[PDB]
């Protein structure tokens, strides 16, 4: 699971470097924030050894992002 | 594991309904539509005994949903 959670992580990254040419409304950057939030809750989790936590909290993360990402049609 | 999926799945389907009165864009559909494929995919996961990746699944699922519900200032 520490792979599955650390290549998530490094992709939540690069899918993140991809956006910041993007404007985001208020709300489009408090979902950003809260992507963020749980990415660091993630680690957290990873680093105690509490996998199943961690997976949820960065898979979590991945959705708010993936939204915006398919509603600022980078994906599809 | 169980007990956090399915509470997650139940919560998915509540907060799902809470959004039926809200028209939704055609990519916030496909949004919306992608969180009930994860959600079907969890529930595969769940009942073959993989709790890691049923639980990342709902979990993402939540995620696409809750960036859907803080742009429509349902949450905050």
Redesign the interface.
């Known amino acids: 699971?520490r792979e599955?959670i650390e290549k998530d992580l490094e992709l939540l990254e690069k899918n993140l470097m991809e956006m910041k040419s993007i404007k985001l409304s208020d709300?489009?950057e408090?979902?950003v924030e809260?992507?963020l939030n749980?990415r660091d809750d993630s680690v957290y989790y990873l680093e105690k050894g509490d996998?199943?936590t961690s997976?949820?909290?960065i898979?979590?993360?991945?959705?708010?992002?993936?939204?915006?990402r398919?509603?600022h049609?980078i994906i599809?």
């Open positions: 699971c599955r709300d489009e408090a979902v809260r992507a749980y996998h199943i997976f949820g909290c898979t979590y993360a991945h959705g708010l992002l993936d939204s915006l398919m509603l049609r599809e």
